[PDB]
Amino acid sequence: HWGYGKHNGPEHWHKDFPIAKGERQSPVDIDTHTAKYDPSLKPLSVSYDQATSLRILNNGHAFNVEFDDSQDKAVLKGGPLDGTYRLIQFHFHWGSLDGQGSEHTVDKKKYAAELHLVHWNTKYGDFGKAVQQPDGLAVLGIFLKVGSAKPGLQKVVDVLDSIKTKGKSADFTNFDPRGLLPESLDYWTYPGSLTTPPLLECVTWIVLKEPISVSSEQVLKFRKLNFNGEGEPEELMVDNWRPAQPLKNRQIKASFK
């Protein structure tokens, strides 16, 4: 199946998922000089105070921190969004070296990693129904750069040891996602898709301008995970990012002057 290697990586995805070459694929390069400030965007609202994390899973492509989304707890709203989107999981994409790993780019600059907080539109009732709609998802994207440590990330970092290989999971309750947010909520927004197969075009992307800093030691532990399952030949989990795709007929809007 799909992966990030030479025989099954992003250049191969289109054969099983033809939408890979579609009209609103993600990620994209964010050209700051073409993006336009949009005075019509309402303030963004990130309400994660009642968030309930449940588990962490190595799914063979990245690791997912999963949240109880059976009630309106952790929600994203305002900004370009209409209605309420509920947090279902977060995950990251990173590189083998600090000069690469993010999916979106900013004037071609690649960050060391990128965090995705995935949310689904509550008017569609469940995630699986939301991903059959053009406005079913909202993903909050946050860049990571290497510098000082991010305190809020350490509990994540500490448990990776226990989910080294594909298919392993650990209990991961009471984690507070607010500790992964930067100070500013200034963002760029555009309509796009999920960046892993099946690459569904159901997402309103909200990419924060301000990156968070994580330590070299923290990112280094991400690089010790495995894409393979227990007992198989070790293939480090690194470079699990899709590169920038064609912007096509899309405009990127800025929330800030």
For 231, residues 6+ apart whose C-beta sits below 8 A from its C-beta are: none
Give the strand pairing for 253-254 and 36-37: parallel
**Residues in the chain, total:** 257
116 binds, among Zn ion, Hg ion, none (CB under 5 to 8 A by kind): Zn ion
14 is catalytic: no
93 is in an annotated binding site: yes
Can you tell me the distance from the alpha carbon of 56 to that of 44, in angstroms, rounded to the nearest whole number? 27
Pick the catalytic residue from 14, 61, 104, 119.
Answer: 61
SS3 20: helix
Is residue 116 near Zn ion by the rule CB under 5 A? yes
- Tell me, residue by residue from 95 to 114, as one string, x for binding to Zn ion by CB under 5 A and - for no binding: --------------------
Can you tell me the distance from the alpha carbon of 199 to that of 202, in angstroms, rounded to the nearest whole number? 9
91 is in an annotated binding site: yes
Task: List Cα–Cα distances, 6 to 3, 157, 189, in angstroms.
Answer: 9, 28, 31
Is residue 61 near Hg ion by the rule CB under 5 A? yes
**139 versus 160: smaller Cβ distance to Zn ion:** 139
Extract the tokens encoding 65: 């921190």
For 189, residues 6+ apart whose C-beta sits below 8 A from its C-beta are: 38, 41, 79, 80, 204, 205, 206, 207, 252, 253, 255
- Tell me, residue by residue from 208 to 237, as one string, x for binding to Hg ion by CB under 5 A and - for no binding: ------------------------------
- Which residue's Cβ lies closest to Hg ion? 61
Q: How far is the CB of 59 from Hg ion (least distance, A)?
A: 5
Residues that bind Hg ion (CB under 5 A): 59-61
- Binding residues for substrate are 195-196
- Binding residues are 91, 93, 116, 195-196
Residues that bind Zn ion (CB under 5 A): 116
